[PDB]
Design a protein around this ligand. Structure first.
Ligand code: ADP
Ligand code: ADP
Ligand code: ADP
Ligand code: ADP
Ligand code: BEF
Ligand code: BEF
Ligand code: BEF
Ligand code: BEF
Ligand code: MG
Ligand code: MG
Ligand code: MG
Ligand code: MG
Lengths: 741, 70, 209, 144, 69, 18
């Protein structure tokens, strides 16, 4: 660690042009009390200040007032490189201008009042772009150094000529200067960032390595991936920090109605990029000027493709210029354009990780006055399938929710907003929680599940099934470290089979409400179409969207509908159900990465299911959800009657013991008949009391008259078939015992 | 019902979305002998289409919807 | 001229659109104190006949910002390189004058999702829209508003943050919404004195817009 | 070099199984007691294991099992070990405990483990193999 | 890929023979074998053998699903 | 062997028909 880089600390010396170093820092780097030092911080900005021995400073970080700190675009707790410059010398002239909102109200001689005593005998070391502050006349004015004669930076000796002018401005320019996007805003794709920045920066800083190794560096970038990942932000940062010439080309921007004008526009753009300097060309959205030369039917597109292929690599092709392209799909590009020399190194800026989302959260929440109690680690851990561009939407929704909360209680004051509430706004944690609960990833906006409202405590009984489903769902989500320490892949599939009216769809809804993963739900024949292969395309697209924004859980409802075994029809319907079964078997376990794809299947007919899809790796857990016993019947009777008023003398034990063959749907029918009878009694009593709350709860008489027409759902033959299938599944566990070692 | 592959289930999904969209509606499902047929197994395309339309009715009547008023 | 008080019955979506239209344009002091740029995209979907064009006319007639109207297929042409030029001319005319509001009506006719169609002109129009809505120096004090009957036939790169981030759901109203629509549409007709609107709103169930 | 991997050789066209297009019809059978031990050794290659734990009893107990079933057994044992580790972590935080997979985890994972293929499909595959061997009729030591 | 020793050795040599020694194949004057088909019970190691061929054998690998094209 | 027995029966039936 070279001791020439230091962190920003609070300021003791309240002077503008000054920084404080400690004496043990002075012997570690020779400097003095009068020495004028150049501070170069982030965003490629600089400033000049006077170093002064400070005992409290402690050598490791430096004290600088908020004015210096601002000009460098840094904060308290940011690193800066310090280095001395005596090459700078006394100014010839200076060009400062007051910022409009800091002088609204007064007028007259700003020089005699503010500037004259501020610069006098101090010979301040200023810089172009600096914004300093002068306190006097019961206010503080801000000027910006617009120009100096002696290069970028100079000193203000008594002989130096200070020129101020009075046409002040609104700070639109100041906001633009602060914004310049810097290399430290694309945090989350380190390997792709390094792979771009290497061929961007290394043949421009020092080409001696390439002159010694003899070979020429690659001059082509193709940034492909999902939309909303940071390719345009990377191109903007390359355009903003790299001092070479830049030229941005949009996709359908060169196209003109004249015959032979788009190729002339491309030639003029390339000759303009080659004429000035070694430059960088960013051609964005190359899927509109490269339709693969075979699937297209026009002539202008083929001639544009030939113009690009000739002008990018041919005779006297490219004299020290590099082309960067950005696309949403890499497959609809010409393979001659995907060649070496034109577009050779294809970086893959893809879906980030937990630390990448934490870096994006720390980048996007560094300019707002957020809180003193909001943590970003849980926000980055509970966010699962966001593409990296929805994090800014999350923070914008949280800020808008906080603003909408502050706008309704206190009056808006539509003429002018009172500035007392602006100093204390903040962003709380429940705003971020509401913004997380009221958003979705941008890739899963088309298969959004409707907002059902159930609870794990609303599904009575089945405690072993519930804890096994919770284990299977939340072990690879919450603890990936144990799974990567043991070096094994987690189990993902689970199938629910049993009698209808039991709680399989209710268990799927209870999963869809409050698991720590995204939910994608389908019906049985919902993904089938009338064309040839469109059902296969729908299956492949929904599985790519499930495995892209991982972790998700897929609820394949009616596996009897979506999957037959094979070839069961004597006369085929075109041979499509077997292809759907084959595509399901390939997508659930094939030549993929298998990041996180949980498959939940709920059927009521396990005889017509493929044994190739009943096999481990796709659906290993064959969970049988049986009919409830007495205790499970009591718990579902207490859970279906969770939010209702009841009589205190009501005993559900006789209802749980008298039925002894019922199910959850039949008990819900009993509860609904009792509620309908109570509603009829309330309507009759209200009509009687209005002709000449009558009942505040449901009585035992309503249940006694509702249990007169109660009937079972399943018969004694379907239960025989289900128990025979369960006994066959238990007979598949033959040649086994307690297995004591 | 229809000739093509999945058009009957698309019509079922369309009429059930029209039912649950402008809720409350009431649907008169006539001839459940013709629609349901109590699937079992028949080893044919008619049996496959019957299984598909029955499972579509099962996922549309009580499935993962809002079940406002049908 | 229609105002904000003619879309009674969809007050939640009215507030959700009126916030991002009025608050960044009336006084930006809260957004400058919090240091967060506001969202700049509206996508009003739902059933046909709910009031999205009426909301667009209300935010056109109410606010003092410039309003440039762009229809669905009116930007198309037969020459190669003309529809993208019309879209670029519309965007520069909306960006050059003032902080303005753009209303692209029927966006499902110029967004065929770039995968199910074989025409290069539609892909070029979608690429021009994706470049003009999110690129280098993309939007300066302007905001786009969409209105479509089907929300699934739009490119996911167009259904993203920065282009169309706030997808409001102007859906069917409840009985109070029918009461507000019946009270708004019957304010210019002297109908009777012994007539009620509560039973008229409570009788119908499937009447939307 | 085309490679086909189909779990039902009945629906294949008989002109593709002709030599010159797909001549090597390799039947991949179920593993025996000497192959299930090697499968369990290959699946447990990158995990810490008990030095006293043997896989011979697991290879000898399962006779109609498959590699997917052995992977399911290994995954259930790992899930039980992860559950015991997080239970010990919660008890330690209330008031590395599990360094490897013990024998009780395998004994609890081998209780809910079943075979993938049934007896009728195995009979169908042996019938297809015997039909292919009956297509290899009139073959012997073949003296010249 | 545990087990399947003879199948693994036969598949590996059938792939690696004409791409490393073509001189013996043109000395004998015959074209090498091309195709190989695996069939059996599901979940046995066919796709695992294909992945083992894809990951380390010097020939270029083009993977394609069934109804994908 | 390459061809099965039923394909030879189908080809013999087609040769007897034509
Ligand atoms: N990895 C990332 N790091 C930081 N900001 C990101 C990242 N990905 C997306 N964003 C933000 O998303 C917004 C839109 O991203 P942008 O670059 O314009 O789109 P795209 O990735 O489609 O080219 C910007 O505000 C940008 O800063
Ligand atoms: N085990 C159960 N516990 C609690 N409620 C149940 C149970 N089974 C059924 N119900 C009630 O009856 C309804 C029908 O159950 P559901 O999951 O929709 O059907 P199915 O069992 O056919 O998948 C549930 O939504 C719930 O209201
Ligand atoms: N929610 C609504 N509230 C009030 N008027 C409505 C509403 N929806 C529709 N209307 C009326 O219906 C007519 C057509 O509605 P409009 O906004 O053009 O819908 P769209 O463009 O979706 O077809 C207009 O006269 C409008 O005033
Ligand atoms: N012989 C084996 N050795 C090791 N693991 C195996 C073996 N057979 C199966 N597996 C495991 O089970 C999975 C299923 O095998 P796979 O080749 O995908 O099945 P299939 O033959 O149906 O295509 C493999 O991916 C692997 O994890
Ligand atoms: F430009 Be982004 F990838 F939508
Ligand atoms: F979904 Be249930 F089993 F009818
Ligand atoms: F008919 Be509207 F555009 F909803
Ligand atoms: F590919 Be295997 F037969 F599941
Ligand atoms: Mg872009
Ligand atoms: Mg169900
Ligand atoms: Mg309209
Ligand atoms: Mg396979």
């Amino acid at each position: 660690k070279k001791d020439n880089m230091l962190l920003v600390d609070d300021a003791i010396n309240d002077d503008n042009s000054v920084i404080a170093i400690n004496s043990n820092t002075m012997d570690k780097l020779e400097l003095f009390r009068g020495d004028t030092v150049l501070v170069k911080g982030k965003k490629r900005k600089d400033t000049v200040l006077i170093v002064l021995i400070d005992d409290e400073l402690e050598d490791g970080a430096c004290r600088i007032n908020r004015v210096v700190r601002n000009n460098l675009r840094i904060r308290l707790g940011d690193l800066v490189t310090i280095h001395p410059c005596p090459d700078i010398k006394y100014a010839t002239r200076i060009s400062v201008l007051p910022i409009a909102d800091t002088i609204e109200g007064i007028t007259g001689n700003l020089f005699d009042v503010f500037l004259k005593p501020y610069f006098v005998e101090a010979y301040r070391p200023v810089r172009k772009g600096d914004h300093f502050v002068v306190r006097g006349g019961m206010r503080q004015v801000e000027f910006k150094v617009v120009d100096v004669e002696p290069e970028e930076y100079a000193v203000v000796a008594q002989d130096t000529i200070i020129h101020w002018e009075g046409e002040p401005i609104n700070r639109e320019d100041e906001e633009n200067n602060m914004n310049e996007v810097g290399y430290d805003d694309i945090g989350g794709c380190r390997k792709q960032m390094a792979q771009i920045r290497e061929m961007v920066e290394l043949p421009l800083r020092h080409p001696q390595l390439f002159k010694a190794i003899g070979i020429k560096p690659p001059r082509g970038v193709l940034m492909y991936g999902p939309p909303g990942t940071g390719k345009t932000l990377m191109a903007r940062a390359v355009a903003n920090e790299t001092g070479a010439f830049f030229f941005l080309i949009n996709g359908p921007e060169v196209m003109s109605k004249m015959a032979g004008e788009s190729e002339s526009n491309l030639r003029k753009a390339f000759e303009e990029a080659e004429k000035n300097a070694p430059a960088i060309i960013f051609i964005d959205e190359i899927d509109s000027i490269a339709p693969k030369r075979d699937k297209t039917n026009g002539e202008v597109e083929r001639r544009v493709v030939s113009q690009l292929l000739t002008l990018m690599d041919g005779m006297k092709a490219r004299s020290n210029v590099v082309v960067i392209a950005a696309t949403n799909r890499p497959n609809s590009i010409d393979p001659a354009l995907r060649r070496f020399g034109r577009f050779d190194r294809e970086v893959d800026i893809g879906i980030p990780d937990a630390t990448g989302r934490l870096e994006v959260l720390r980048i996007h929440t560094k300019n707002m006055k957020l809180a003193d109690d909001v943590d970003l680690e849980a926000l980055a851990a509970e966010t699962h399938g966001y593409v990296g561009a929805d994090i800014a939407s999350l923070c914008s929704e949280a800020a808008m929710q906080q603003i909408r909360e502050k706008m309704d209680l206190i009056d808006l004051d539509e003429d002018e907003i009172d500035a007392e509430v602006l100093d204390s706004l903040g962003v709380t944690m429940d705003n971020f929680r509401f913004a997380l609960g009221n958003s979705n990833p941008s890739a899963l906006r088309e298969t959004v599940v409707e907002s059902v409202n159930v609870t794990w405590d609303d599904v009575g009984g089945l405690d072993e099934i519930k804890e096994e489903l919770k284990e299977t769902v939340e072990y690879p989500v919450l603890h990936p470290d144990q799974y990567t320490k043991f070096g094994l892949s987690p189990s993902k599939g689970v199938l629910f089979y049993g009698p209808p009216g039991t709680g399989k769809t209710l268990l799927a809804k209870a999963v869809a409400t409050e698991v720590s993963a995204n939910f994608i739900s389908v019906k049985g024949p919902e993904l089938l179409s009338m064309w040839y292969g469109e059902s296969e395309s729908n299956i492949r697209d929904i599985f790519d969207k499930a495995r892209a924004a991982a972790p998700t859980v897929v609820f394949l409802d009616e596996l009897d509908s979506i999957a037959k075994a094979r070839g069961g029809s004597l006369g085929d319907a075109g041979g499509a159900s077997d292809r759907v079964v084959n595509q399901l078997l390939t997508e659930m376990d094939g030549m993929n990465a298998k990041k996180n794809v949980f498959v939940i299947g709920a059927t009521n007919r396990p005889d017509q299911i493929d044994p190739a899809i009943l096999r481990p790796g796709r659906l290993d857990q064959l969970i049988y959800v049986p009919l409830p016993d007495e205790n499970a019947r009591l718990s579902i009777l207490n859970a279906q009657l969770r939010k209702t008023p009841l009589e205190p003398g009501l005993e559900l034990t006789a209802i749980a013991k008298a039925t002894q063959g019922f199910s959850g749907a039949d008990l819900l029918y009993i509860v609904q008949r009792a509620a309908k009878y109570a509603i009829k009694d309330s309507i009759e009593a209200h009509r009687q009391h209005e002709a000449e709350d009558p009942v505040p709860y449901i009585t035992k008489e309503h249940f006694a008259e509702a249990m007169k027409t109660a009937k079972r759902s399943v018969s004694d033959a379907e239960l025989r078939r289900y128990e025979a299938y369960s006994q066959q599944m238990k007979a598949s566990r033959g040649q086994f015992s307690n297995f004591n070692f």
